[PDB]
Structure formats: structure tokens, C-alpha cells
Design a protein around this ligand. Sequence first.
Ligand SMILES: [Mg+2]
Ligand SMILES: [Mg+2]
Ligand SMILES: [Mg+2]
Ligand SMILES: [Mg+2]
Ligand SMILES: [Mg+2]
Ligand SMILES: [Mg+2]
Ligand SMILES: [Mg+2]
Ligand SMILES: [Mg+2]
Ligand SMILES: [Mg+2]
Ligand SMILES: [Mg+2]
Ligand SMILES: [Mg+2]
Ligand SMILES: [Mg+2]
Ligand SMILES: [Mg+2]
Ligand SMILES: [Mg+2]
Ligand SMILES: [Mg+2]
Ligand SMILES: [Mg+2]
Ligand SMILES: [Mg+2]
Ligand SMILES: [Mg+2]
Ligand SMILES: [Mg+2]
Ligand SMILES: [Mg+2]
Ligand SMILES: [Mg+2]
Ligand SMILES: [Mg+2]
Ligand SMILES: [Mg+2]
Ligand SMILES: [Mg+2]
Ligand SMILES: [Mg+2]
Ligand SMILES: [Mg+2]
Ligand SMILES: [Mg+2]
Ligand SMILES: [Mg+2]
Ligand SMILES: [Mg+2]
Ligand SMILES: [Mg+2]
Ligand SMILES: [Mg+2]
Ligand SMILES: [Mg+2]
Ligand SMILES: [Mg+2]
Ligand SMILES: [Mg+2]
Ligand SMILES: [Mg+2]
Ligand SMILES: [Mg+2]
Ligand SMILES: [Mg+2]
Ligand SMILES: [Mg+2]
Ligand SMILES: [Mg+2]
Ligand SMILES: [Mg+2]
Ligand SMILES: [Mg+2]
Ligand SMILES: [Mg+2]
Ligand SMILES: [Mg+2]
Ligand SMILES: [Mg+2]
Ligand SMILES: [Mg+2]
Ligand SMILES: [Mg+2]
Ligand SMILES: [Mg+2]
Ligand SMILES: [Mg+2]
Ligand SMILES: [Mg+2]
Ligand SMILES: [Mg+2]
Ligand SMILES: [Mg+2]
Ligand SMILES: [Mg+2]
Ligand SMILES: [Mg+2]
Ligand SMILES: [Mg+2]
Ligand SMILES: [Mg+2]
Ligand SMILES: [Mg+2]
Ligand SMILES: [Mg+2]
Ligand SMILES: [Mg+2]
Ligand SMILES: [Mg+2]
Ligand SMILES: [Mg+2]
Ligand SMILES: [Mg+2]
Ligand SMILES: [Mg+2]
Ligand SMILES: [Mg+2]
Ligand SMILES: [Mg+2]
Ligand SMILES: [Mg+2]
Ligand SMILES: [Mg+2]
Ligand SMILES: [Mg+2]
Ligand SMILES: [Mg+2]
Ligand SMILES: [Mg+2]
Ligand SMILES: [Mg+2]
Ligand SMILES: [Mg+2]
Ligand SMILES: [Mg+2]
Ligand SMILES: [Mg+2]
Ligand SMILES: [Mg+2]
Ligand SMILES: [Mg+2]
Ligand SMILES: [Mg+2]
Ligand SMILES: [Mg+2]
Ligand SMILES: [Mg+2]
Ligand SMILES: [Mg+2]
Ligand SMILES: [Mg+2]
Ligand SMILES: [Mg+2]
Ligand SMILES: [Mg+2]
Ligand SMILES: [Mg+2]
Ligand SMILES: [Mg+2]
Lengths: 49, 272, 92, 9
Amino acid sequence: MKRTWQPNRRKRAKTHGFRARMRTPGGRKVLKRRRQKGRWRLTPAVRKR
Amino acid sequence: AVKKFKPYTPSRRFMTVADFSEITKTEPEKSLVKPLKKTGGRNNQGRITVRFRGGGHKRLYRIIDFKRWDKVGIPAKVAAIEYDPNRSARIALLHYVDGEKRYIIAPDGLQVGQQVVAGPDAPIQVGNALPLRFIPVGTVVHAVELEPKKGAKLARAAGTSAQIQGREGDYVILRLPSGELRKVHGECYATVGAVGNADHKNIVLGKAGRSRWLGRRPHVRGAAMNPVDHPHGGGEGRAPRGRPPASPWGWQTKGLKTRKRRKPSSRFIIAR
Amino acid sequence: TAYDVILAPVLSEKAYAGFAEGKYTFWVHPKATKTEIKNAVETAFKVKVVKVNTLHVRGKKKRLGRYLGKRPDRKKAIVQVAPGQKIEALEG
Amino acid sequence: XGGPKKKKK
RNA sequence: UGGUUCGUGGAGCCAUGGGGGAAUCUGGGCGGACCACCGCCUAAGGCUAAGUACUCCGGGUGACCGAUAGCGCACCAGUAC
RNA sequence: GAGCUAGCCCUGGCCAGGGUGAAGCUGGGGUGAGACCCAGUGGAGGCCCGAACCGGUGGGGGAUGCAAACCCCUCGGAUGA
RNA sequence: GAAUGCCGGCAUGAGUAACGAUAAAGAGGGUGAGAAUCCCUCUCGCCGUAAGCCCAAGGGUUCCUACGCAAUGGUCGUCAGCGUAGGGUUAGGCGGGACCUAAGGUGAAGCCGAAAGGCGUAGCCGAAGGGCAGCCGGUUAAUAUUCCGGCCCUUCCCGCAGGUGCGAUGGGGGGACGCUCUAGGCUAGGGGGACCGGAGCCAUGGACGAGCCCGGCCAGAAGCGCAGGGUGGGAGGUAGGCAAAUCCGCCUCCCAACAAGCUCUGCGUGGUGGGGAAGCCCGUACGGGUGACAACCCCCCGAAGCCAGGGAGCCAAGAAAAGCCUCUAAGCACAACCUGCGGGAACCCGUACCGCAAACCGACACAGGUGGGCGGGUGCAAGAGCACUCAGGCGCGCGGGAGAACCCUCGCCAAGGAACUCUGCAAGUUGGCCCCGUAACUUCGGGAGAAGGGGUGCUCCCUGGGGUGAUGAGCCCCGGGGAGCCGCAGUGAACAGGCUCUGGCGACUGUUUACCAAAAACACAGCUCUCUGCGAACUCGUAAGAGGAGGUAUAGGGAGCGACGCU
Ligand SMILES: [Mg+2]
Ligand SMILES: [Mg+2]
Ligand SMILES: [Mg+2]
Ligand SMILES: [Mg+2]
Ligand SMILES: [Mg+2]
Ligand SMILES: [Mg+2]
Ligand SMILES: [Mg+2]
Ligand SMILES: [Mg+2]
Ligand SMILES: [Mg+2]
Ligand SMILES: [Mg+2]
Ligand SMILES: [Mg+2]
Ligand SMILES: [Mg+2]
Ligand SMILES: [Mg+2]
Ligand SMILES: [Mg+2]
Ligand SMILES: [Mg+2]
Ligand SMILES: [Mg+2]
Ligand SMILES: [Mg+2]
Ligand SMILES: [Mg+2]
Ligand SMILES: [Mg+2]
Ligand SMILES: [Mg+2]
Ligand SMILES: [Mg+2]
Ligand SMILES: [Mg+2]
Ligand SMILES: [Mg+2]
Ligand SMILES: [Mg+2]
Ligand SMILES: [Mg+2]
Ligand SMILES: [Mg+2]
Ligand SMILES: [Mg+2]
Ligand SMILES: [Mg+2]
Ligand SMILES: [Mg+2]
Ligand SMILES: [Mg+2]
Ligand SMILES: [Mg+2]
Ligand SMILES: [Mg+2]
Ligand SMILES: [Mg+2]
Ligand SMILES: [Mg+2]
Ligand SMILES: [Mg+2]
Ligand SMILES: [Mg+2]
Ligand SMILES: [Mg+2]
Ligand SMILES: [Mg+2]
Ligand SMILES: [Mg+2]
Ligand SMILES: [Mg+2]
Ligand SMILES: [Mg+2]
Ligand SMILES: [Mg+2]
Ligand SMILES: [Mg+2]
Ligand SMILES: [Mg+2]
Ligand SMILES: [Mg+2]
Ligand SMILES: [Mg+2]
Ligand SMILES: [Mg+2]
Ligand SMILES: [Mg+2]
Ligand SMILES: [Mg+2]
Ligand SMILES: [Mg+2]
Ligand SMILES: [Mg+2]
Ligand SMILES: [Mg+2]
Ligand SMILES: [Mg+2]
Ligand SMILES: [Mg+2]
Ligand SMILES: [Mg+2]
Ligand SMILES: [Mg+2]
Ligand SMILES: [Mg+2]
Ligand SMILES: [Mg+2]
Ligand SMILES: [Mg+2]
Ligand SMILES: [Mg+2]
Ligand SMILES: [Mg+2]
Ligand SMILES: [Mg+2]
Ligand SMILES: [Mg+2]
Ligand SMILES: [Mg+2]
Ligand SMILES: [Mg+2]
Ligand SMILES: [Mg+2]
Ligand SMILES: [Mg+2]
Ligand SMILES: [Mg+2]
Ligand SMILES: [Mg+2]
Ligand SMILES: [Mg+2]
Ligand SMILES: [Mg+2]
Ligand SMILES: [Mg+2]
Ligand SMILES: [Mg+2]
Ligand SMILES: [Mg+2]
Ligand SMILES: [Mg+2]
Ligand SMILES: [Mg+2]
Ligand SMILES: [Mg+2]
Ligand SMILES: [Mg+2]
Ligand SMILES: [Mg+2]
Ligand SMILES: [Mg+2]
Ligand SMILES: [Mg+2]
Ligand SMILES: [Mg+2]
Ligand SMILES: [Mg+2]
Ligand SMILES: [Mg+2]
């Protein structure tokens, strides 16, 4: 059947990107938490040009 | 007149379509004056706030003239009468000698080629606009302003009118389509005649689809729902209500008057 | 800084085949435009540059057990020389 | 799995 | 209405949203309703070290652990997944 | 978190081939003028058969499966909500 | 020593079930330490509106090649999509950006909110929509509308030559639009050919024959030629298009009413360029040579594609903005703009490979899911259906034997035909087309494919219409009539309704419990009640605000009933 993962580079970027997270206090805290944690990747890596 | 069909299909046996014979050879509209992009959307910034809206034909807005006092004294020739997707009435395309082209909402009896004009001057004829005062008591009228210089707001639906009843210092009394008795300021413009396309009420949609074409989504009964959804939801195999009939939001829907009492508008109203 | 643009030449059975024609092809700085790439190979070889073609070459994911990484991203430019000229330093 | 089936039979 | 031990209690004091609305030393607040007496203070402007809290970081010590323990990680771990 | 799913918005795409034959046109007939009737034309429709396509009726298989909803036969719609 | 305890390790069932579609394999020869499994040849089977090609998304080295087999491969493995190394992705014209605007997002002004923040005309952002200049071949092991060859365009900038009041983010025009059906002429694609060109081939009884087999194009500026799309030309008056206009708009007189004329496309032709089979000979893991001086012509069918902004009809009444044309304002008219010709300048990112799948979404080399374009030939009425088959691609990554029960999937059956059973569940009968022929009832449409029947192949003769051709030969479509032939059987295979009568419920097409319920539930047109005079009622939000609605009682919100008839 159709599963739940339907990859889209634009969606992933607009949805979970560094700039989206930065836009709101909710998201800014996510970066803070991930930084303090020592996460190698703050936001998902969306590729291609 | 109303177009009628033979039952060559079920739902074609009741279906019924407007007569478009008053639609003069001018079916597609007029750029310049209108159209605008019209912005379909069944809801506010976010959430739906009027249920069951959506779908249905794309539209172009015809930006019509609801304040006729710009062109006081300037007459215009009625050039055409065309279909307007965004109202029950039809619209008149008129050419002002000025050059300017406006649409007026098209009254019953309006003929193409006719002369029409607005102002204190203005022969009392079908199509003309006047401040309410100079209009003879008892004449039927439409596109009436509520307060002066604020635009036509009463009687624009197809086949509607108001009748002038009498006067009272600065106000003339109106009898509105609903039957209400209203004091409306003398200085309010209103155009003589009834609205026309009066056979609009006689049309039978005929099937579900037609409803959808006009963007009317299926309306579901409270009875059909559940207690979470509606006061009428549940219980077992059908149910008669079990309380005084209500809206989904709990207010009673048979009888409960809802106009606020202390409206300052009150001292200008005399009926139902 | 013009000997900063051009890094090294590309050595391969394909780069050479551009020596019959006037297409000398070098690795370049990833951030360098066709237009500064011309102005560079001109002054460094005193040659009339007529066509610049550039392409990105993506780095290779190589692994050395447990430790997996990626090589540096490079860029190629293959540059066309006006009729008759040659870049002697590549003619090997 | 996570069910979600209701106890039928 | 909040604060104080104070949950309307005899409920003061200290803050305040609403209404009314003074006075300049013979002026004003308080000492638990209120009044008298006797006393303590001088509101509606602001700044002020130190003593106190903490431990990302550096150092010392341990009737603290010794690789299923001790931090999640003694090992390229907030990694692989 | 609406990359699954529900709805709506904006903008594009898709629907083989067959049937049936409304209005309306044209001619003829009829009448004081009509209504209406015959052809011929016409090509209407949440119209019909039926692929793609969207489904999931009934039965069988499958049940540590090919598969955490599949497969075979059969079946609903398929110019419209 | 226990907590269906926690982590780890190893047992049991067990050499048991399984090894992922029943599309299918056999052999010879290689290579190798080692071959059912790798390479090659021959034979066989399968897909072919694909199981074949080309994109988009997504994936990110999987591409090519060299050397390799510990693991990954459900077996093997000399192979690989795996390991090590190296090589590979070339653009002014394709796509995206130095262009535009949609929903929506953001957001100066401004409004609101304990804070965080929420709204918000202008503007900006925002795309398979608008705008925009490359076609055909040739090369690599791997890239090509990118490199190369030919032919053809686009912008800027600087020049000369000449034309004109030039000239704005501003005005106007245009761009610019629905659904259904469609006409004319073309192209793509396809069939045929006694004509043109070809290596060859007479087999096994017969055939040296207008014999068999293979192939008979593509691109192409200017100029033509043929289709067709756009569009009236004047002169006056002017108060409107938010300044100004000669422009547009509105009046009034002339000439046109025609596509005559201007332009704009499409298609043919075109200077020239390129391609160019079967077969045979070679060595590949494949490509090459020859066939060639290859020929490269005539008919026929013909689009859903092009001319395109074509035409007709209908109601539900069908984006914007910029490029483009034009008008003027500030300015400036030694500027500037336009035409022509020259030289010069033309960036950034993408390009490999998979792409109905072993490379994407499903923990897997997973029988599932996945958007667009091409999708040949024959026959069956047609068709993207169905059977076989071009090109192309595969035999699905365990095999070999055996011929028990039992299961799955399928074929057939004496006599009876539902006696089976909760139920004819299942399976069968029926089945396509053409033509007779059709009842109750009916809202006059329907019920109707009612039911029930007959015809269906092949041969010969006669003959009626078209279509393309000139009024004809041919080639292509529909027909009619008459004799006759064979078989058990003529939609001889494949695809293709069982029917009728009578009740209940729901009017009907529809919708619904993704993953046990598709229904008599929901919806539905329609009927009624009620609310609401517009800063409407109602709804969301603390508010601002927004929906309702740029609607106005024939309107909008709520409730019930649910076509229609009688009530
Ligand atoms: Mg416009
Ligand atoms: Mg909201
Ligand atoms: Mg938002
Ligand atoms: Mg309902
Ligand atoms: Mg329910
Ligand atoms: Mg409730
Ligand atoms: Mg009951
Ligand atoms: Mg109830
Ligand atoms: Mg590039
Ligand atoms: Mg308290
Ligand atoms: Mg006090
Ligand atoms: Mg005190
Ligand atoms: Mg005391
Ligand atoms: Mg004190
Ligand atoms: Mg110890
Ligand atoms: Mg140890
Ligand atoms: Mg540890
Ligand atoms: Mg640990
Ligand atoms: Mg007729
Ligand atoms: Mg039809
Ligand atoms: Mg239908
Ligand atoms: Mg069907
Ligand atoms: Mg469903
Ligand atoms: Mg014990
Ligand atoms: Mg257990
Ligand atoms: Mg264990
Ligand atoms: Mg056993
Ligand atoms: Mg056994
Ligand atoms: Mg077994
Ligand atoms: Mg297998
Ligand atoms: Mg070997
Ligand atoms: Mg086959
Ligand atoms: Mg790799
Ligand atoms: Mg490979
Ligand atoms: Mg193995
Ligand atoms: Mg496997
Ligand atoms: Mg090898
Ligand atoms: Mg490899
Ligand atoms: Mg382009
Ligand atoms: Mg730049
Ligand atoms: Mg923009
Ligand atoms: Mg906008
Ligand atoms: Mg905002
Ligand atoms: Mg942009
Ligand atoms: Mg575009
Ligand atoms: Mg000018
Ligand atoms: Mg404009
Ligand atoms: Mg012989
Ligand atoms: Mg040509
Ligand atoms: Mg003006
Ligand atoms: Mg050849
Ligand atoms: Mg048209
Ligand atoms: Mg703009
Ligand atoms: Mg302009
Ligand atoms: Mg490429
Ligand atoms: Mg490619
Ligand atoms: Mg390739
Ligand atoms: Mg596809
Ligand atoms: Mg496999
Ligand atoms: Mg698969
Ligand atoms: Mg599909
Ligand atoms: Mg075809
Ligand atoms: Mg057929
Ligand atoms: Mg098929
Ligand atoms: Mg029997
Ligand atoms: Mg028998
Ligand atoms: Mg019998
Ligand atoms: Mg029985
Ligand atoms: Mg029995
Ligand atoms: Mg029964
Ligand atoms: Mg059955
Ligand atoms: Mg029955
Ligand atoms: Mg029945
Ligand atoms: Mg029903
Ligand atoms: Mg149904
Ligand atoms: Mg279910
Ligand atoms: Mg079911
Ligand atoms: Mg059903
Ligand atoms: Mg509003
Ligand atoms: Mg509105
Ligand atoms: Mg209502
Ligand atoms: Mg009901
Ligand atoms: Mg009911
Ligand atoms: Mg009922």
C-alpha cells in the first residue's frame, strides 16, 4: 500500500529547516536543546540544488 | 419563464434552469470596470467558521456601482444586461456620456438603449437614482442606502423592492423586502424600480450536483451525529431530540430571538 | 591572486584527448567563475582563451574501516584556446 | 501488532 | 483581590484594578477593628559594595565505582541505529 | 506533527472505443392566428455497455503470509458530487 | 532460584518449515583450484498500452573499467547492484536563477495582545501557471539539444549609417483563459506497391517466378506555395480612464465590411548537411567491415497532435502579474529611442546511473504502492480490450528425483437434476455483433439487452453507394442479390449478461466504519419551522481581526423531514 513516508526535499526543508526552527520560540528552544545535547545535526540534512 | 426539461434522466425530471433571454448578446463580461480576482475560501485565518462551504464553479467578481452619487446629473446609456455569478440579480452594463463605464444592478423593465441617470434632478423612471426624499411617496424602489453616503445595502436580491410609505422630518419610512418598517434618512440614495429576475425563486435545483456547482457542501443533521458533535447526537435507533431543538453550539433554534436589545438602531425600526 | 584559481591539471585518458584540439582542462577552485577562470589561464600561460566549460565533480565516499568519510569536492574547467595556440606545460 | 482488533470471537 | 502564620475572621498592616478624592510640621502613616491617651516613624524619586546562591571551567582530597559498575559515552558517542 | 489520512484553497494533468438520441434548428401538415403532430438534422445527460483509472461486493487462498490488509476468480463507478 | 524480572551467552523444536509468484528450461564450448548458477553459440518458453523506450519525484556513486570473493546474494558463484583502486557528469538556446504574478507566507504604515506574540492595504517572497532565443546527425568504456559537424537563433555593450520629440515603477491596450461537441487543411504514425535498391536463397513433392527475404528517409534559413489566426481606415467633439496624453473610452459625420490589405503562425518545398536493411565476413565482455555511388519513388488510412486567441451550443459563467504595443509627466531634446550593419560581451546551479523498481515508499534483491509522454503489426464491429508477435526486454538467485495420503489451482463425468445447504454459497448455464421480436406497469422518459428466437465460416457469380483520385484505373470504406463447399461444431481459439415473477427498505447517481459492518445508515434535490435590517444573525479569536460577504429577506445562519402523489 501507500506508506507514510513520501519524501519531498522542499517539504522537509520548509518544515524542519534551520530557518523554520529559527522563526518561532518553540523552534528556537529546539536548537538550544539540540546544541546543549551536543547533537552533530541540529536540523535534518535536506540535500540537492 | 424558467426552462424545463423532459425526464430523459432522473433528476432531469424536476430540474429547471433560468431563462436568459434578458441576457443581451454580451455573455462574457467587461474588463476595465471589473472583474477582480475573487478569493474563494470557506473560512477565516485558519479555521472554518461557516460550515459546508466549498467546491463549485470558479468566479470573477463584477465590481458594481452601489453609490450612484458620483455621477450626479451625468446620464448614461444602458449598453447591455449580463449574467452575474456572484448575486441573484442580473447586472446592467451602462455607458456614461462621460465615457466611464459602470455596472448597475439590473432592475425589472430595464431595456437596452435606455437612458438612465442619478441625482436630485432625475425623472422618476425605472433605472434612475435619487435621494429618497425627492422620490414620490408610494413608489417602489431598490438598492437603497441605509445611512447617507454609505452605499446601497437594502433590496438588491432578485425580484426585491421596498416601498416608500411616508416621511418624518428628515426620514422617510420604508417597507423593506422582509416587511419591516424602517426609518431611513432622507438623504439616502435609492433607485426606482424593482430588482427583476423575479423568477429566481421558481428555479428547482433538481439534483445534488447542482448544489455543489454553487459551492454548497452537504449539510448534515445533528441527529446524524454523536453527543460529542451535537446536542442532537445519539442515542439509539433514531431519536426525537429530547430537549428543545438546538444549534451545535447549544443555543435554541426554534424561536429564540437573537437581535441584541440595546442596539441604538432600535429607535428607527417599526416592524417585523 | 591568479595562480590561486588554477590548482593542478587533470591527468586522464580523457583530458589528453583535448590536446589534439585546444582544450586544456584543469582542476580549479570550486568557487571560481568561468570568467575569472579565463582571466587566469590567460595570464598564467599567455594564451588566448576562447571557450570555458566548467563542471562540478562530487567527492567520493571512501571508507577506511569504521571511519567513513568523503573526499574534497573539486571542479573542472576545460578551456578552449584560439586557433594555433598551445599550452606547452601540458604537452607531456 | 499493536492490536488493534477488538475481542470478537 | 493578592501578600503575611492569617481560609472574612473582631482583620490590621503591605501591595493593588475600579469609584470618590486632601494636606506641607498646628502637615501625615503606624503600634491588629474603632476611639481616647501615650509613643514609633516621615510614604507617594533613585543608586549602594561586603557577607549569600551556583559549578560550564582549573586544582586538591576520598572507610567513591572498577567495564552489566562509575556520567548515556574509560574505546573518535549524544556517534551508529 | 496534515510528506499517512480529512477538508478547503491556488495551479496543471487525465478519462480507449462503443451505445441511447432531449432541447433546439429546417422542411412539411394543421389553425383566424395558435397549441400541437410528422420526418430530417442536431448531440443533451450526477444517461447506458466497457478499458485505463478510482474502487472493494461475494467466494476461495493466504494466517511465524509475497504482504503488520496481499493474491486469484467475481463484482461497483467510469463527463462527474 | 524464582518477580510472563533486566543484560548477555548457549540450548530445544530440527537438519524439521522454508528458500518470495507454476513465464521453463536443454545442450555444446570456454574460463577456473573449484561451475545447474559466470562468458559465448545453438535450441525452447515468457512479456510486448510491457515485464519495452523517454522524463518527473525521490535515491546519492549504485554509472564505466581494472583487480578480487571474507561477508552482503535466501543455494552456488570465477558473477554482481558487494570489496579495493582509478576513470566518468562540459550549455547564452534544456531546466532553475540575475523575469512575473496565484493560493499562501512574510510584511513597512497601522491595529491588537500579561510576555513570548497575533493580525495587517503597499512591497517582497512564493510555480510542472504566465514569459523566454536549437534543430538534425557524429563521436566516449562511461557525457552530450552540453563536446564535435552542418544549418539557425537570443540578449546586452560599443561603434558607424539613417529614421523620430525621446522619454516613467504612471494611463490604456494586450497578455486573458470555462465545459461539451465540433469544421477545413496539415503533420506524427501506419498499410500497400506490378516501381526503385540489395547481399543472397530453390530446400522435401512442386516453383527461376511482376518469386522469397530486407529496405525504400531525416533535418533544413531566405524566398515561395498552400492552410489558417489575429485586426476596420479616416476627421472632428470630449466633462471619463484619480497629474498629463495625440493613447484608450464615449458621442458625431465620412469611406470599409471585405480577412481585399497589413502582419502572425503551422505545414510543404527548399542552398546544403546527415542517415542508410536483410545477409555474409569478423574476436570481443560487443562493436566493426562489406552489402551502397545503396535506393531513397507512387498510392492508401490518418489522428486525442499542429494552424489556436478557429467554429457552434450550454450554464455552473470560467486567475493574476510581467514581457510586448501604445500614450504622455517630470526631465532632456550636442540627450535619448527605433531600424540596419559590424565588432565585442554573454555569468550562477543542475546534467553520471536507477526511475511501475534489486538503486524510490514498504526493517528484506518484499507477488504491495508510485505522477507525465511514446506504446508498432495482424485479426476479432470498434478500442489503450483480447489472442499471437515486431523492436526491445526477460525465464522472476536453490536444484535434482519421485508419481503415496492430504492441500492448493485446474480439466472431465454415467443417470438424476438443489434431493446439498442458514442460503443454489460456490461453480456452471448465458455470453460478441447483425436482424425479427418484445408484457404488466409507467412520473410518457422509461420498464428494453424485457422475455423468446434466427443469422455468423469458406468458394464463385452478379450487382448498389461512396472516399481519394479529373468527370476514370487503382487504393480504401460501407452494402444488396443468387448459386455452391466442408466439419460434431463457422464471435470454430482468446476477450463478452443466466433469466423471470413477487414482497420489504431506501426515490434515484452518490457517501461511509484506511485494517472484520457498503446497508434500510449518511448525503441528496425538495418541504416546513425558526433566527437575521447589515458594524446582520451565526462562527473562530483575550483582543485586533476574519469568515458570513466585497452577499443584503428570491439573502444568509440553525433545526427537522428527505424525489414525487394523496395527506
Ligand atoms: Mg487587468
Ligand atoms: Mg483563526
Ligand atoms: Mg499562520
Ligand atoms: Mg442533511
Ligand atoms: Mg451514528
Ligand atoms: Mg452533546
Ligand atoms: Mg427506538
Ligand atoms: Mg437526542
Ligand atoms: Mg554547468
Ligand atoms: Mg490571603
Ligand atoms: Mg490605613
Ligand atoms: Mg507601628
Ligand atoms: Mg492597639
Ligand atoms: Mg515606625
Ligand atoms: Mg572497589
Ligand atoms: Mg571483567
Ligand atoms: Mg557503562
Ligand atoms: Mg551504558
Ligand atoms: Mg428533432
Ligand atoms: Mg451522448
Ligand atoms: Mg454515467
Ligand atoms: Mg461502466
Ligand atoms: Mg473508501
Ligand atoms: Mg525464593
Ligand atoms: Mg511466554
Ligand atoms: Mg534471552
Ligand atoms: Mg516435526
Ligand atoms: Mg515433513
Ligand atoms: Mg520442503
Ligand atoms: Mg525466487
Ligand atoms: Mg577462478
Ligand atoms: Mg507470447
Ligand atoms: Mg559503494
Ligand atoms: Mg555495474
Ligand atoms: Mg553465498
Ligand atoms: Mg533473500
Ligand atoms: Mg571481472
Ligand atoms: Mg563495485
Ligand atoms: Mg530556457
Ligand atoms: Mg552575479
Ligand atoms: Mg515578485
Ligand atoms: Mg497576495
Ligand atoms: Mg503575519
Ligand atoms: Mg524571484
Ligand atoms: Mg514556466
Ligand atoms: Mg514619447
Ligand atoms: Mg498596465
Ligand atoms: Mg524438389
Ligand atoms: Mg524538409
Ligand atoms: Mg486626467
Ligand atoms: Mg550501413
Ligand atoms: Mg474560440
Ligand atoms: Mg510587479
Ligand atoms: Mg507603459
Ligand atoms: Mg547527461
Ligand atoms: Mg542521462
Ligand atoms: Mg547512458
Ligand atoms: Mg509510467
Ligand atoms: Mg530476486
Ligand atoms: Mg517489488
Ligand atoms: Mg498508476
Ligand atoms: Mg496507437
Ligand atoms: Mg472487437
Ligand atoms: Mg493486454
Ligand atoms: Mg453428471
Ligand atoms: Mg449426461
Ligand atoms: Mg432439468
Ligand atoms: Mg432443500
Ligand atoms: Mg437435508
Ligand atoms: Mg433463498
Ligand atoms: Mg453464485
Ligand atoms: Mg426481488
Ligand atoms: Mg425489491
Ligand atoms: Mg439508496
Ligand atoms: Mg449506489
Ligand atoms: Mg471496515
Ligand atoms: Mg466489506
Ligand atoms: Mg454497495
Ligand atoms: Mg466582516
Ligand atoms: Mg467579504
Ligand atoms: Mg434558512
Ligand atoms: Mg431521516
Ligand atoms: Mg428517513
Ligand atoms: Mg421516510
